[PDB]
Amino acid sequence: MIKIGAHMPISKGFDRVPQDTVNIGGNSFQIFPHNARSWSAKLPSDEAATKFKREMKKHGIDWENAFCHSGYLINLASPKDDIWQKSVELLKKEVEICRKLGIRYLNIHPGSHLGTGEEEGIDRIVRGLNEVLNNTEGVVILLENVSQKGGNIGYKLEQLKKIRDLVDQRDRVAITYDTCHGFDSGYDITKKEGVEALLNEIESLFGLERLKMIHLNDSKYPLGAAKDRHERIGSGFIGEEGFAVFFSFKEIQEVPWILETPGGNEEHAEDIKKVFEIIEKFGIE
């Protein structure tokens, strides 16, 4: 029923990810596309990509439940042309990594304008997305909501809509909702009226079909804190009671839930168990 997993390490190879996912009790995952520390990234070898696909098949992982997260360096809103250009080129490479692996989705944070203006930053993001999308095929870019820190763009869903609606290939732009980033920004999923408002907002701005992933993160801080410090499920200010409200909506259950909570595979296995404990304890249908 539930589509759930975690951000998984790739350091031992992409092909380990399907088994590792099953081993933590998941049926979905997110991975980085590389471990580059600068502006160039290698492709997986032919052998590595084939082995990954083989393991995906062996473990029966639904390809609609497998996601890449773009690297930490890319910033399509940067007012520094160096950074903008290098970001565009690395994002193209990340799309090609996804395409080689068969991954259908590449999730990005829109960017930060570093205090040079939301409108101008949105236009730079759009320009960058057009350069990437118009020179690649297949892969859909997911825009993730973020916290309101520095010059970040995307702390309100309206900002994601402004970007998406300007991109040429808007069918290749969809949305990821991160519960911690959202909670930081005033999206109060701890009350049913807050979840209803969130869903109404998604439906109006994008259509619900565009919600492709939820990043399921508790928060170390209260509603509105703008801190971006994730917490283990049930251990933060969203809490067991808040997640029970969020989980109760069928619209939410339809979308994969990907943990980005503190820790590694073992903590994530515990968090998946906690999610099911919450569903059971609160009698969620």
Nearer to Zn ion, 71 or 194 (CB): 71
Specify the stretch interacting with Mg ion by CB under 5 A; choose among 42-50, 98-106, 142-150, 182-190: 42-50
Nearer to Mg ion, 40 or 45 (CB): 45
- 254 token code pair: 């339809």
**Which residue, chain included where needed, has tokens 């005033």?**
186
CB of 101 to Mg ion, least distance (A): 16
- 226 Ramachandran zone, left/alpha/beta (phi>0; psi -120 to 50): left
Query: Could you give the 3-state DSSP secondary structure of residue 13?
Result: coil
Phi, psi of 132 (to 5 degrees): -70, -55
Q: How far apart are CA 151 and CA 189, in angstroms?
A: 25
For position 228 contacting Mn ion by CB under 5 A, the verdict is yes
Candidate residues 15, 20, 55, 178; the one interacting with Mn ion per rule CB under 5 A: 178
Pick the closest to residue 30 from 108, 85, 84 (CA basis): 108
- The interface partner of residue 228, options being Mg ion, Zn ion, Mn ion, none and the CB cut-off 5 to 8 Å by kind, is Mn ion
Binding residues for Zn(2+): 69, 109, 144, 178, 181, 215, 228, 230, 260
Query: Could you give the 3-state DSSP secondary structure of residue 19?
Result: helix
Binding to Zn ion (CB under 5 A) within 99-158 occurs at 144
Specify the stretch interacting with Mn ion by CB under 5 A; choose among 9-17, 79-87, 128-136, 225-233: 225-233
CB of 143 to Zn ion, least distance (A): 10
Are the C-beta atoms of residues 275 and 2 closer than 8 Å to each other? yes
Element (H, E) at 107: strand 105-108
Nearer to Mg ion, 43 or 199 (CB): 43
- The interface partner of residue 218, options being Zn ion, Mn ion, Mg ion, none and the CB cut-off 5 to 8 Å by kind, is none
Instruction: Provide the β-strand partners of residue 230.
Output: 219
Candidate residues 40, 45, 135, 204; the one interacting with Mg ion per rule CB under 5 A: 45
Are the C-beta atoms of residues 33 and 94 closer than 8 Å to each other? yes
Q: Where does this chain bind Mg ion (CB under 5 A)?
A: 45
Q: Where does this chain bind Zn ion (CB under 5 A)?
A: 144
